[PDB]
């Protein structure tokens, strides 16, 4: 109870005095105070207006164009400290174009902890020459006090009143001249002995406690301070906040629960109206410092395992990605706060480019929509996407929506990828190359489709395999649909592969830069019914020696009569070209 009343937030009071009464119970303003643009106010409006409870402002005080106000002596009689934690253009105190202000009269103002004073263009303003600012600010060098009545030869500043010129206000030197120091005709400037430093003193000249700032009711007692030099707790001024408290806004001690209440879910307002408070080095602060991220269950900043997660808050809660350039805008993002719309119709090396820019996204808080993305064969470029929350949904309550994607054959590889969808429904329409099995797998994993695709079906087997150091010769089963008539084509795929990790729907072949070497194999000639296995084959040439090749065959995509089938694909076989004979390794070794 050093500040008995409320702690209020910063305020911005304009036009009318109505909202000003919101300050009536504040002991401390935790923020700034701006009072401005009151053109219709007159002295009578301020005669019976007072906020004697206000002791301190943590940021700055600004007064601009407030008509009728002639002094601040009745408005803020007890304002003792302006901390200047945040400033107005390096200023902690701003008095500007206060037409009618005759004196400041802030007779209890002892300390301005940080920042400077700007008092400018106050045409009636006097009692400025009588203030010794060196008692209030450590450096007066940056003060800007000009264009006031005081500049001319019209101020009749008078401090003496009781006896007049016989033992009244303290006097201090400017350069060589002693000047009596006062705020008004009835109020002296308080000056303490030098041993008191900034702590203040009683009327009898006895020093306040070293934890006090500016003034106290009793000497050398940290429970009797008007304001604190360091931190405030339970009517006491302390050097540091003791356990279990945290340092808050560089002036008070708060408990975990307070910090927790601030943090909690300021639903929308990310852009100036939330922060989400965290704990770091016994401080409750707006956000984690660089190199730290927030451990969620206890609000505690912990150092990042590698680079820090990066939350990208989208404008209006959405973003449409229709190019490599727009995707780049999300490079480095690990969390999307909002929803994504994918609309990619063309380009080059898209799977790699999209994976580079979007491959780190682990979570999307809203929905994901893929629509008219003609160029996409897979959504695997979203390499790390594990969660879609569905906190926002597409009209019809959809969290995942896929519409009119003409080449989409894969969502994610459900043998490896896990994706969770907390809320909302799925929508799939006009995805002609996407089998319903992939959609059904997604439903399982997550908690007009495929009509132009025949989905794996039959198995072609290799009847023959032959290696050369530079070549591979293969044969495989002939394919014959129900009505054996008009068989036209095979397709052989081969890539240089390491071990195991090879798939058909790999690194989006799409249109351009390809992940697979491809051969069109002409359909064979049957040559009657008895012994018609004139096994289609191929001679691979242009291969590196001692190299493993992922290889598989497919039968060209046939719109069949009645129950439609394209046919068969072979399994992925790995074939390693020949290398050196042991004998031949030996030779080259054994003979220079």
């Amino acid at each position: 109870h050093l500040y008995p009343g409320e702690v209020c937030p910063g305020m911005d009071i304009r036009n009318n005095l109505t909202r000003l009464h919101e300050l009536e119970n504040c002991s401390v303003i935790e923020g700034h105070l701006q009072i401005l643009l009151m053109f219709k106010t007159r002295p009578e409006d301020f005669r019976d207006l007072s906020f004697p409870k206000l002791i301190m402002i943590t940021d700055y005080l600004l007064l601009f164009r407030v008509y009728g106000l002639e002094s601040l002596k009745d408005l803020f009689p007890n304002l003792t400290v302006i901390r200047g934690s945040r400033l107005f253009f390096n200023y902690a105190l701003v008095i500007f174009e206060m037409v009618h202000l005759k004196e400041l009269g802030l007779y209890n103002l002892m300390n301005i902890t940080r920042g400077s004073v700007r008092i400018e263009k106050n045409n009636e303003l006097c009692y400025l020459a009588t203030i010794d600012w060196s008692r209030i600010l450590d450096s007066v060098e940056d003060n800007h006090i000009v264009l006031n009545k005081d500049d001319n030869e019209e101020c009749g500043d008078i401090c003496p009143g009781t006896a007049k010129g016989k033992t009244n206000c303290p006097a201090t030197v400017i350069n060589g001249q002693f000047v009596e120091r006062c705020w008004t005709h009835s109020h002296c400037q308080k000056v303490c002995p030098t041993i008191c430093k900034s702590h203040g003193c009683t009327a009898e000249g006895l020093c306040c406690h070293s934890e006090c700032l500016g003034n106290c009711s009793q000497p050398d007692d940290p429970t009797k301070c008007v304001a604190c030099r360091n931190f405030y707790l339970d009517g006491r001024c302390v050097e540091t906040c003791p356990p279990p408290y945290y340092h808050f806004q560089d002036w008070r001690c708060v408990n975990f629960s307070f910090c927790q209440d601030l943090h909690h879910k300021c639903k929308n307002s990310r852009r100036q109206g939330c922060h989400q408070y965290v704990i770091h080095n016994n401080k409750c602060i707006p956000e984690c410092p660089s190199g730290y991220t927030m451990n969620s269950s206890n609000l505690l900043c912990t150092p990042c395992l590698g680079p820090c997660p990066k939350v990208c808050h989208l404008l209006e809660g959405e973003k449409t990605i229709d190019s490599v350039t727009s995707a780049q805008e999300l490079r480095g993002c690990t969390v999307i706060n909002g929803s994504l719309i994918i609309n990619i119709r063309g380009g080059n090396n898209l799977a790699a480019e999209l994976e580079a820019n979007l491959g780190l996204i682990e979570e999307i808080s809203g929905y994901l929509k893929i629509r008219r993305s003609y160029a996409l064969v897979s959504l695997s470029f979203f390499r790390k996407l594990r969660l879609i929350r569905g906190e926002t949904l597409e009209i019809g309550n959809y969290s995942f929506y896929a519409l009119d994607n003409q080449n989409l054959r894969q969502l994610w590889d459900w043998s490896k990828h896990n994706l969770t969808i907390t809320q909302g429904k799925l929508f799939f329409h006009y995805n002609p190359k996407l089998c319903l099995s992939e959609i059904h797998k997604m439903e399982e994993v997550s908690g007009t489709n495929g009509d132009q695709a025949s989905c794996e079906n039959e198995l072609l087997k290799f009847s023959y395999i032959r290696t050369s150091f530079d070549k591979i010769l293969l044969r495989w089963e002939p394919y014959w649909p129900p009505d054996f008539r008009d068989l036209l084509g095979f397709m052989l795929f081969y890539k240089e592969a390491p071990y195991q990790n090879v798939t058909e729907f790999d690194g989006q072949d799409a249109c351009g830069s390809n992940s697979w070497t491809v051969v069109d194999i002409d359909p064979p000639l049957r040559s009657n019914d008895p012994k018609s296995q004139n096994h289609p084959g191929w001679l691979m040439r242009g291969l590196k020696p001692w190299t493993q090749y992922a290889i598989f065959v497919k039968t060209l995509v046939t719109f069949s009569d009645e129950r439609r089938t394209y046919g068969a694909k072979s399994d992925i076989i790995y074939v390693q070209t020949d290398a050196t004979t042991f004998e031949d390794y030996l030779h080259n070794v054994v003979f220079v």
């Binding site: 036009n15 009318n16 643009l37 053109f39 164009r65 174009e97």
Partner: peptide
């Protein structure tokens, strides 16, 4: 045309709050 202190004044002519 419009400037300095006059902007404040110009705006009040218009505002009339």
């Amino acid at each position: 045309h419009l400037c300095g202190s006059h902007l404040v004044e110009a705006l009040y002519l218009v505002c009339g709050e």
